[PDB]
Design a protein around this ligand. Structure first.
Ligand code: C2F
Ligand code: C2F
Lengths: 271, 271
C-alpha cells in the first residue's frame, strides 16, 4: 500500500540548464560559460542531487554543445548530470566527458531506442530514465502506461541494468489541456513500484503539469506532494522554488522516510 | 487504485467553534451569541459545508450549552452542524433543535458507544463519524486501524445506516511526537474505501497532524493533499486558512473530480 518500503532520500534534478530558456540558449550561442556556471552553482546550493542538461534548439553540432555544457558545469560544481537529449550521439559524448555516474534522459519504449540506449547505460554505468510511450503516442489510461513500463523493465533487465538504476517516467501533461492524465499518472507511479524487487524507481518532469497555466507554483507543488504519496522517487523540477522544496521536505517527513525534527526543512536540503 | 471512482465535492467542516478556543469558551460563559455568530458567518463565507460544534470544558450543563450553540449558529447561517461531544445526551439535544441533517462526532468502536450512537443517527437521519479506536487505545498499524473500521462498518450496516452516511476517522496524531502514524493513517484511508459498495466515507480532524509543531499551516496543507490522494472525503479543518483551501482545491482538480478552469480556486469554494 502507501507505506513506503524504502527510506531513500527524494532525488531532486534541477531543471534549469535547458536551452529552451533564452539565457541558456544565448550562453551556448556566445560560448559564454558564465550563465551556465551560475545556474549550476545556484541549483547545487539549493540542494539538487543532479543537474538536467538540455541543449535546446540549435543549428550547432549537438555533440560539441553537450560536451561543452557538461564540462563547464562540472568545473564549478561537483554534481552528476542528467543528460537530456533525443540524440544518442550527444548523450554518449556527454558520458565520455562526465565525471562520476550520470543519468540518461531518456529512452522511449520504442524497441530501436531501447536497443541503443540501454547498452549505453550499462557501458557507462549511468542511471537511465525510460518514458512510457512509443511512436503510437503517450497512452491515456494508467493501464496502458503500465504496460509500457513493464516493457521497459524487461529490456533493462535483459541488458543487465539493475532496477535501482532504472527510472520510469509516466509523462505528466498540463492540467489545463490534459487534466484527466494527472490522476492516471499517479496510479501508474503506484503500479510501477510493484513490478519487481527491488522495484524500478520513478521520475517526472514535474513542471509539465503546469505549463501555460495560471498559478504554476501552486499546481507544481500540489502535484509533487500527490506524486510522492503515490511513490515518486525523483523529479526534474525547479529547485529554485523554495515553496516547492518546502512541500517536498514536508511530504518526505509525513511519509516517515526521514526522522522528524523542528529543523527538517533545512535538513532535507543537505540530504 | 488511486483513480477515484466518485466525483463528489470534498466536504469541509469548519473547526473553529470549539470551546477549546478562549473566545468561544468566554462567549459560552457570558451567553454572548456574538462571537459564535461571527465565526459561523466567517466559516460559511469561506465555504464550509458543515460547522463543527464543541462545547469545550465546562461546568455548565452540556445539554443546554449544545442546544444554545446550535440554535445561535443556525439563526444566522444556513449550514448543518457537526455535533462534537463525548456526551450522548448533549448530542441528542443538539439533534432535536437542529434544522436539516446533522453529523454526529463521534462514536468509537467501543460496543456500548456504537450501541448508543448508531440508533441516534438513524432516528435523526444524521451522518455519523466513527473513530477507529476503543478503550484499548488507538492502534498503531494501518492493519489494526482497518480492523476497527470494519467493525464500525458492520455495526452501521446492522443499524440500517447507509455507507454514504458513515465517515470513518483513522485518527491523525501530531508529526512531532507521533510521526510514524501519519503514513499509517494514509494507508487506512485507502483500505476503508475498499470495504463496501458504495464505500464508507472518510474524515480526519486535520489540524491534529500539526498540534504544537513549528509551521502548522505548511504541515496541515501538505498532509491534506496526501490524504486526499489516498481517498479522503472530508476534513474538520481551518477553512479560514486560504492557503489550505487553495491546496485542497488544487488537489481536487488534479484528482479529476471537478472540471478544470482558470477560476477553479473560486469555483471550488462555491461548491
Ligand atoms: C519535457 N520535460 C521532461 C524532461 N525529462 C523527462 N524525463 N520528462 C519530462 O517530462 N525534460 C524536459 C522537460 C522538463 N524540464 C522543463 C524545463 C522547463 C520548463 C518550463 O516551464 N519552461 C519555461 C521556459 C521559460 C522561458 O522560455 O524563458 C516556460 O514557461 O515554458 C518545463 C519543463
Ligand atoms: C480532536 N480533533 C478531532 C475532532 N473530531 C474528529 N472526528 N477527529 C479529530 O481528530 N474534533 C476536535 C479536533 C479537531 N478540531 C480542532 C480544533 C482546533 C485545534 C487547534 O489547533 N487548537 C488550537 C487552539 C488555540 C487556542 O486555544 O486559542 C491550538 O493551537 O491548540 C485542533 C483541532
Amino acid at each position: 500500500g502507501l507505506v513506503p518500503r524504502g527510506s531513500h532520500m527524494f532525488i531532486m534534478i534541477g531543471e534549469r540548464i535547458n536551452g529552451m530558456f533564452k539565457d541558456i540558449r544565448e550562453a551556448i550561442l556566445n560560448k559564454d560559460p558564465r550563465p551556465i556556471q551560475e545556474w549550476a552553482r545556484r541549483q547545487a546550493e539549493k540542494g539538487a542531487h543532479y543537474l538536467d542538461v538540455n541543449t535546446g534548439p540549435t543549428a550547432d553540432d549537438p555533440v560539441r554543445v553537450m560536451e561543452w555544457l557538461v564540462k563547464t558545469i562540472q568545473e564549478v560544481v561537483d554534481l552528476p548530470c542528467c543528460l537530456d537529449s533525443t540524440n544518442p550521439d550527444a548523450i554518449e559524448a556527454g558520458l565520455k566527458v562526465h565525471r562520476g555516474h550520470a543519468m540518461i534522459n531518456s529512452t522511449s519504449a520504442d524497441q530501436w531506442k531501447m536497443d541503443i540506449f540501454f547498452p549505453m547505460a550499462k557501458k557507462y554505468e549511468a542511471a537511465i530514465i525510460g518514458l512510457t510511450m512509443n511512436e503510437k503516442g503517450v497512452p491515456k489510461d494508467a493501464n496502458d502506461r503500465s504496460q509500457l513500463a513493464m516493457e521497459l523493465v524487461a529490456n533493462a533487465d535483459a541488458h543487465g541494468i539493475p532496477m535501482t538504476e532504472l527510472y520510469i517516467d509516466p509523462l505528466i501533461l498540463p492540467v489545463n489541456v490534459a487534466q484527466e492524465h494527472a490522476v492516471e499518472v499517479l496510479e501508474t507511479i503506484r503500479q510501477i513500484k510493484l513490478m519487481a524487487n527491488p522495484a524500478p524507481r520513478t521520475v517526472l518532469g514535474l513542471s509539465n503539469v503546469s505549463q501555460k497555466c495560471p498559478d504554476r507554483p501552486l499546481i507544481n507543488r500540489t502535484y509533487l506532494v500527490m506524486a510522492m504519496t503515490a511513490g515518486l522517487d525523483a523529479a526534474i523540477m525547479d529547485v529554485d522554488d523554495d515553496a516547492l522544496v518546502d512541500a517536498a521536505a514536508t511530504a518526505h517527513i509525513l511519509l516517515n522516510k526521514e526522522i522528524y525534527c523542528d529543523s527538517y526543512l533545512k535538513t532535507f536540503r543537505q540530504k
